Amino acid sequence: DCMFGNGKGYRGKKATTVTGTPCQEWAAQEPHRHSTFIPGTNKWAGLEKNYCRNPDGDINGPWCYTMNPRKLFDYCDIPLC
Ligand SMILES: O=C(O)c1cn(C2CC2)c2cc(N3CCNCC3)c(F)cc2c1=O
């Protein structure tokens, strides 16, 4: 699928970053601990499995926590609608 504007409403199944790195699941706390952007308390941003999302409305578009233990997050690569 494509993304509208900055992709805040994107609900597709892309689950890798721009470089191909697998995404970490939003509910997971490994390999990266995070107190923010958890599905338990954010019920409105579609924080589902390990899919690319944009809960903070970054102009750069949808992103995910990465499975690389050194690198916290990266943007994904989804075309503009
Ligand atoms: O406290 C935390 O766990 C985090 C706090 N922040 C904000 C900076 C204070 C984050 C910001 C991130 N970026 C997402 C993409 N748009 C820019 C901000 C991010 F990927 C993760 C976190 C955290 O885990």
Curated annotation (Swiss-Prot):
Locate the Kringle domain: which residues? 1-81
Which cysteines are cross-linked by disulfides?
Answer: 2-81, 23-64, 52-76
What does the entry report about post-translational modification of this chain?
A: N- and O-glycosylated. The N-glycans are complex biantennary structures present in either a mono- or disialylated state. The O-glycans are mostly (80%) represented by the monosialylated core type I structure, NeuNAcalpha2-3Galbeta1-3GalNAc, with smaller amounts of disialylated and non-sialylated O-glycans also detected.
Question: What biological function has been recorded for the protein in this entry?
Answer: Apo(a) is the main constituent of lipoprotein(a) (Lp(a)). It has serine proteinase activity and is able of autoproteolysis. Inhibits tissue-type plasminogen activator 1. Lp(a) may be a ligand for megalin/Gp 330.
Similarity section: Belongs to the peptidase S1 family. Plasminogen subfamily.
Q: What else is known?
A: Apo(a) is known to be proteolytically cleaved, leading to the formation of the so-called mini-Lp(a). Apo(a) fragments accumulate in atherosclerotic lesions, where they may promote thrombogenesis. O-glycosylation may limit the extent of proteolytic fragmentation. Homology with plasminogen kringles IV and V is thought to underlie the atherogenicity of the protein, because the fragments are competing with plasminogen for fibrin(ogen) binding.
Task: State the oligomer form and interacting partners.
Answer: Disulfide-linked to apo-B100. Binds to fibronectin and decorin.
Name assigned to this protein: Apolipoprotein(a)
Origin species, per record, is Homo sapiens
- Stretch of the intact protein here: 1719 to 1799 of 2040
